[PDB]
């Protein structure tokens, strides 16, 4: 009942980072403190890693196991967006704002950062555990994918949105909003596929799947807290970002058909402001009048 | 943004749900209060102005020396006594940006509208002060408009030629091809549009001195001509414009057409060379019956019969060509070729279509030659004889190359003044003067045909404007009735003026005795059919003017028999691109493309409503694309029955209609007697 | 040396089925004979069936085994074009020209057809034989992929190009030309990835891989000749189609860095109509001798 | 594969580590016993053969009618008495594929080598049986080889022109440009390579009658000429080849060069027109001193001084041009321009380099005109006067357009027969006959210059072959000594024959009295310096032949003063591309590109070893790319000191060397007196 409308929405949202000129951010970037620039680079690098794996691994593997040519076409399109559009856009931003050495250093930093490695290990592990014709392993990977789309990106998205909302780094911010617009529909779509599998189960099996989903969310959440503190303490925003990730965790649960898990909190209003001609043959009657 | 531009853009701003058309008038005032008067050079008296313009090599001394200064001052005073005011901003802008004489530094205005009109009138009269005043009254009433070359360059020392339509015949030889390239370059240097007939050229894969598969065809000649026209571009002012015409029975016709396809390679496509296709009735008959046609190799036909393929009647020669084993030919599908023509016209508006038999069944000078091709604007249709340009130190055989003299009647201004006869005769006299004063020393056949044929083209414009301001739809039968009557009177007075000039000078055009004018055949339909208006509204429009009857046409026929006719050709309806703006008129006899046209000059936007457009006549100013092309064809055929040459007839198509609709319009034009089809403009 | 350049060319060629209006083809379709309509339907179904294998297996399997983030992104983009763009385009052409029952029957026929099946299963067999961390098996699959993209499609493309060059079925011919333009670049790109593997091999292993490629080409070519006669004899075109197959086989070989196998031949003109030395400054005293 | 093809490919199959050169001989035998003798057309006697070739429009009957059939039979018997055998397969293959006369369908061979030589000799002799036998003995011994046009087309009805190269001067006018395009097409139709001097054409951004920034420059004329040469491509057999020459002080010199850049846009790139650059000594002096130079607008200089920029000496007028405010100029870096020349020659081998001062410091006809440009092969260096092609119906001022007839001495065969004098005199007579019977009816300046200058080009081939077959390294001083002596002998006997022809005809070339031949200046270095060999080996090589001394040169100078010279120009060393194969000779005086060349014909491949290549002379046949270009420059300068026209000097470069090395080679060539540099071929 939904794939065709998602197909149409995904293809109509198609974009490339080159559509957005980035040289306009040069001055507002220059004006940020060293702490702010550091957090910003690292935040986008963490996002780049997530999209790299979502494009290389997550979306293609889910596409492989989901039945139906139209469902596969949507998932293939989403996969392309992840690595050919989203992951690449971050390099466009980096290449504009930062010198090569700072770019090299931040990519080295992703490799050695323990929270980023842990979250990649956990998410990719679940993708690679999918067994052919085994719907339960597929469900588990789809939960992981929804958590990546609708929860994990948001510790990263906070900062570009926070600046956009203050009228700073607005070209980079425009790119990020386009990425976010895509991930929102990706999270909903994968959520609907996960619910399909969940709804086939016995009540006992469903109870176990909810346990899996909630245990996984909590494990990812605890890691994301440490990641958030590590990045945002130097810019004074860790508590604010934490509220934002809890907000989005609830959206991820809802995408999976589950009740919200965290209590509602006031999000920084700045971040909320951040959101040939046709040819016919000649008939013999056309020669007479 | 200048004040006049704001006042002009205020037209689109709607007040009470209506366009502020009157604001345009205010813009004109601003354009004269803020810009034109400030940048117009003023002199203490006209004597000082004329001395400054002559001494600084702006004007010519010869034409001004024919009058005393008192006569020139009287002519200028007659021009200024009208107190002419441009009714729209675009009229004055186009005149003072395109035609008004400016200093060498192009920052000051030396000529007003009255000054330019007076100078052109003095040039026309050639020493007659009363004739000069008559011309001044003709042009300041805006009844007649000399073409852009004549209007812009008359009386100016730094000028191009007053003729800009040139038709060249190219003979099948390397010497003739090189001479054609040279003449095209020389005429583009003079500022003229050059049309070349390539049908006599042998096709690709023909023999040169009895070596086989040697000829490059007409496409290599088109590449050479395209390079020549790119090189000769009016001293780097306008893009060099040229046209090539090929008969549809020439074998290269596909490759010819392939020069306009977007997919064509760089060694095939010609970009600055317009193309036209000549379609004899035989091709239309073959397509109609779905019989497969044959495209012939011209050199084999020339070897077998001693005459070029385009020099003989294909209707009687096609079967003999097909049955002749010594004539080489290739099988084609004429319906496929028609569909290819329609597709190419949809993509790019090319080629121009010439219906050879439609032209030649009413051609008065078939004895001299049949009309084999048209001009760059596809409205000049005259007899031409090819020239034999031999080697060096050998006498060339100079033929006839067409070069007619353009000038347009303003139908609205002519008919509101009830002066069809006077305007037509004065325009004919001015065109005769410009043809006589044209001397081209690098185009021998053009010069010879100008001296011999004395052919002029008297066109008309503001037909749709006049009809819309009189509450007449362009597609209505009343509009066709008016066009029939008006252009029959134009033809009558043009023939009368030509015969009067022949009687006065004692000479006719060369080979007039063989023409249908001399034999009286031309007047047949005029001595038997009455062309008086059949509708009371059109008759009331013609009130106050004598409409020639059958007895008047018989008297004119007798007068032509006794005295002859000075001009081989008199009437041709040119597109009238930019002069229609200055005259505040709709272009040619075509229907308007847009009611209000948006243009971008510099970094500024400007708005030109069609002349006389208001709320009352908004519906009568129907756009050309919304019109039925069959009724436009009917109107153009109604006009064409009174025009000896062709009419620049642009098709106006919607993006929805397909190539079948385009082919149907072309075939209905062929059926209705349309001589030429100019362009297929898709909205 | 090449992936970013191909990325650029791929993304700038992006298009969607909806851009070409198909309905105006019915004005020439109605004038074709039964044999012409039959051949067209069968060719179209052949292309559709082969392209589906490439979208579901061929491109995604190669993307899975190739190392490099940028290569995976380009390959993902190509897989997207197969599934989201090409497959929808073929379906659109079919739905325009034939009623539902006729489409189902043509696909039933082509699905059972011996020559279509032989080539489809030969290609799919090589994709299924790729082994993790074995570059030889990957190379063999890449050869199969290049043969599909740059060679096997062309016995099919011939007919739409033949009509397109005559002014018939112009809307669907425009679509086919866009598809073909994508397959051309796909073939060139996968060819470069195969050459990279080939160049890492010993001389004996290279000779062995060359023998594999030529042997595979021979098997496919002999089946193409039979496929060609089966479809095109009824419309009298087989001789010219065979020339077009060999010409495209040579292009496929050149994509794999191999010499042409077949002598040069001219192609049907209707189908054709459808289709630094080191700068060193003068140091003075170079003017004196 | 053919048997002779296998035998020729057997050369590279080494036996005992050595090439099987003798197998080549076997191939020729096969090529004759399996193909040539079977494909030849034999008649009962020579009478039937001559009649069949005459009536079937293969031969012109006029030149054969000057002899009785007994004399023609005697000439043919003299040709066949030598029993000439082609020593290599490629010699016979090249003759019978490019020069032997075939039937209309090209299925059989009508002309053998002896038949072709007899026909050419009979054409040369013009009715003299003994002279015809002398020519037969000269050509069958392969001492002299007429150029490809003359050898291929002599005595043929379907022939083209016997002149290989034509040089046109283009005046700065549209009429002159169009005439140049026409003449270029006419001469390419005749088969000759056309070179055009574009230095008189005004640069881009010049005024055409007081409207400024109007000219397209030399690039537009270049595009026109490129399209003209593309169109006139020898009836589609050989691609039309043209050359454009521009002075390095022309403002368009960069744009000129930009026509050959591989990144040039299609609107600028020219692909069928070779480019040459004429460099005066002033430019080299400015580049040497690193002083910024000035390129000039030709039209401003012509307006100020009344003469064209290339019509006067830049070495004395450059400072006046720079200090003149009425002359327009642009600043350039001469060293950057030299580096651009080197880069362009590395990328594409263009432009040709003509050192104008090197040409004109020894030019004998500076009074008529200075040499301002060269031919398509950059070896013709003659005085030319520009023509004033006026408007139609106006008389044109016909100037002098260079044209000379080519003929090459085979150095190995000439020195083996010890017949430098006889071969040179007979070749001069044959070239004089070719000039006399040349009449071009579409190039007036070419015809007038042929009639007046009487210029001929007597080249030489097999210099490297003779040196390698005699154990002399091409770069050795002994080789340069041999070249000095041999070409001094050639110049001496060419001057003697020219003076003898002038005496026997009582006429000299036009304006000979002002030449250095008449004043005796030309003989200065010949009456004070002895050019006898300085090495004993070279003197032994010249044994049996009287080497002219200073006394013989003084006697020749007195003889010239008494009688004059018939030819303005006598010696020019053409590349001799394909006719060197038939003569079994190395191309021109250039060193061999490769010892064995692999050429693909049809689907087969053939290997041509250099003539006389073997184990003992393998290293004497050093490849040109492996040679020091400075010593090749020394050789070419040594030859050039005895050649009145230029030498087609191709530079042979390695890929490792930079543009700085190419610039150093060019500057050393300029320093050593090299007149022209042909090509920069990189290995
Ligand atoms: N619409 C117009 N078309 C042409 N010229 C105009 C126009 N409006 C103004 N001008 C020029 O500006 C001058 C000033 O005209 P304005 O409307 O102020 O009154 P006027 O009574 O015509 O003036 P004047 O004393 O100049 O005759 C005119 O004489 C004329 O030269
Ligand atoms: N290398 C060659 N060059 C030219 N013609 C050749 C060559 N080889 C063979 N021929 C031609 O083919 C013929 C074959 O004869 P071949 O040379 O084998 O010797 P032959 O029969 O003893 O006679 P002869 O040598 O006296 O002509 C020759 O007479 C000659 O006409
Ligand atoms: C006509 C024309 C000339 N030219 C250039 C090329 C010629 O070398 C140069 C001379 O043209 P000319 O034929 O000499 O023009 P002209 O004689 O009327 O002008 P002037 O009195 O100044 O000589 O102008 C163009 O570049 N484009 C053109 O269209
Ligand atoms: Mg001829
Ligand atoms: Mg001039
Ligand atoms: Mn993403
Ligand atoms: Mn996503
Ligand atoms: Mn596809
Ligand atoms: Mn593909």
């Amino acid at each position: 009942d939904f794939t065709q409308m998602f197909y149409n929405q995904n293809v109509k949202q198609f974009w490339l980072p080159e559509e957005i000129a980035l040289n306009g951010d040069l001055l507002t970037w220059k004006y940020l403190g060293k702490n702010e620039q550091d957090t910003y680079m690292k935040v986008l690098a963490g996002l780049t890693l997530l999209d790299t794996e979502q494009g290389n691994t997550g979306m293609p593997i889910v596409a492989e196991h989901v039945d139906g040519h139209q469902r596969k076409a949507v998932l293939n399109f989403m996969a392309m967006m992840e690595n050919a559009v989203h992951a690449k856009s971050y390099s466009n931003i980096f290449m504009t704002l930062a010198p090569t050495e700072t770019i090299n250093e931040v990519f080295e930093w992703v490799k050695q950062n323990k929270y980023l490695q842990k979250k990649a290990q956990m998410i990719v592990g679940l993708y690679k555990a999918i067994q052919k014709d085994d719907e339960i392993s597929l469900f588990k990977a789809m939960v992981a994918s929804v958590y990546l789309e609708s929860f994990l990106f948001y510790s990263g998205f906070y900062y570009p949105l926070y600046f956009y909302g203050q009228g700073k780094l607005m070209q980079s911010g425009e790119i990020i909003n386009l990425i976010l617009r895509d991930e929102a529909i990706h999270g909903v779509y994968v959520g609907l596929l996960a619910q399909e599998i969940y709804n086939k189960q016995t009540e006992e099996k469903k109870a176990e799947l909810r346990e899996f989903a909630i245990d996984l969310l909590n494990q990812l959440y605890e890691n994301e807290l440490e990641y958030t503190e590590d990045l945002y303490d130097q810019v004074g925003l860790s508590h604010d970002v934490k509220k934002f990730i809890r907000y989005n965790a609830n959206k991820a649960l809802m995408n999976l058909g589950f009740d919200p898990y965290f209590e509602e909190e006031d999000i920084n209003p700045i971040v909320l402001n951040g959101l040939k001609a046709t040819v016919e043959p000649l008939k013999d009657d056309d020669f007479y009048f | 943004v200048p004040k006049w531009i704001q006042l002009n853009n205020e037209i689109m701003i709607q007040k009470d749900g209506k366009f502020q058309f009157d604001k345009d008038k205010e813009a004109v005032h601003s354009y004269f209060v803020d810009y034109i008067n400030q940048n117009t050079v003023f002199f203490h008296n006209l004597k000082e102005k004329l001395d400054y313009l002559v001494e600084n090599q702006y004007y010519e001394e010869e034409f001004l020396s024919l009058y005393s200064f008192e006569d020139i001052k009287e002519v200028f005073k007659t021009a200024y006594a009208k107190k002419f005011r441009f009714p729209s901003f675009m009229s004055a802008f186009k005149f003072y940006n395109d035609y008004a004489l400016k200093t060498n530094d192009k920052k000051k205005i030396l000529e007003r509208y009255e000054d330019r009109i007076s100078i052109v009138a003095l040039f026309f009269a050639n020493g007659d002060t009363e004739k000069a005043k008559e011309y001044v009254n003709l042009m300041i009433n805006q009844e007649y408009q000399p073409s852009t070359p004549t209007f812009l360059n008359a009386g100016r020392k730094r000028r191009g030629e007053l003729v800009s339509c040139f038709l060249l015949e190219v003979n099948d030889s390397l010497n003739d091809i090189s001479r054609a390239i040279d003449i095209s370059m020389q005429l583009s240097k003079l500022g003229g549009g050059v049309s070349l007939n390539l049908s006599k050229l042998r096709a690709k894969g023909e023999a040169i001195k009895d070596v086989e598969n040697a000829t490059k065809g007409v496409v290599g000649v088109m590449k050479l001509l395209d390079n020549a026209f790119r090189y000769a571009d009016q001293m780097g002012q306008r893009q060099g414009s040229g046209a090539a015409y090929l008969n549809i029975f020439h074998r290269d016709i596909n490759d010819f057409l392939d020069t306009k396809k977007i997919s064509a390679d760089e060694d095939v496509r010609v970009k600055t060379l317009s193309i036209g296709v000549v379609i004899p009735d035989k091709f239309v008959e073959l397509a109609r019956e779905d019989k497969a046609a044959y495209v012939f190799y011209p050199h084999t036909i020339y070897k077998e019969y001693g005459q070029h393929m385009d020099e003989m009647d294909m209707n009687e020669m096609y079967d003999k060509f097909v049955d002749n084993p010594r004539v080489k030919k290739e099988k084609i599908n004429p319906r496929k070729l028609l569909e290819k023509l329609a597709m190419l016209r949809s993509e790019s508006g090319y080629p121009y279509i010439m219906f050879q038999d439609n032209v030649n069944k009413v051609h008065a000078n078939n004895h001299i030659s049949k009309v084999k091709f048209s001009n760059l604007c596809s409205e000049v249709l005259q007899a031409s004889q090819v020239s034999s340009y031999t080697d060096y130190d050998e006498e060339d055989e100079i033929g006839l190359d067409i070069s007619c003299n353009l000038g347009s009647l303003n139908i609205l201004n002519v008919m509101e003044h009830k002066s069809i006869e006077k305007t037509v005769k004065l325009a004919t006299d001015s065109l005769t003067h410009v043809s006589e004063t044209t001397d081209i020393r690098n185009a021998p056949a053009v010069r010879r045909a100008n001296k011999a044929m004395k052919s002029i083209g008297l066109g008309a414009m503001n037909l749709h404007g006049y009809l819309a301001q009189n509450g007449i739809a362009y597609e209505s039968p009343e509009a066709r009735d008016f066009a029939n009557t008006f252009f029959m009177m134009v033809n009558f007075y043009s023939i009368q003026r030509s015969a009067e000039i022949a009687k006065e000078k004692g000479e006719t055009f060369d080979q007039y005795e063989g023409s249908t004018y001399a034999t009286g055949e031309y007047f047949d339909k005029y001595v038997s059919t009455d062309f008086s208006p059949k509708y009371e509204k059109i008759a009331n429009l013609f009130e106050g003017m004598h409409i020639p009857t059958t007895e008047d046409w018989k008297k004119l026929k007798a007068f032509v028999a006794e005295h002859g006719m000075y001009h081989s050709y008199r009437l041709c309806i040119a597109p009238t691109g930019s002069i229609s703006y200055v005259q505040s008129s709709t272009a040619s006899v075509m229907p308007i493309m847009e009611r209000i046209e948006e243009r971008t000059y510099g970094n500024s936007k400007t708005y030109y409503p069609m002349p006389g457009l208001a709320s009352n006549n908004w519906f009568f100013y129907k756009e050309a694309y919304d019109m039925d092309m069959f009724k436009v064809v009917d109107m153009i055929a109604t006009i064409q029955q009174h025009i000896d040459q062709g009419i620049s007839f642009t098709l106006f198509l919607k993006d929805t209609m397909t190539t079948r609709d385009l082919n149907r319009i072309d075939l209905y034009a062929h059926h209705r007697g349309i001589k030429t089809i100019y362009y297929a403009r898709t909205k």
Side-chain angles (χ1 to χ4, degrees), chain B residues 175 178-179 182 186 216 227 233 391-393 396 442:
Chain B
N175 280 331
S178 64
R179 182 54 84 208
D182 159 56
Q186 300 291 339
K216 289 212 164 191
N227 230 293
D233 52 348
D391 305 335
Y392 206 84
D393 80 350
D396 307 302
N442 271 328

Side-chain angles (χ1 to χ4, degrees), chain B residues 25-33 36-37 80 83-88 92 96 112-114:
Chain B
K25 298 179 192 154
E26 320 295 52
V28 202
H29 212 303
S30 172
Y31 186 59
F32 280 92
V33 151
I36 291 307
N37 295 347
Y80 277 91
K83 270 100 216 173
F84 174 83
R85 305 289 168 240
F86 290 97
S88 86
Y96 285 104
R112 300 206 93 107
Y113 197 47
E114 292 91 331

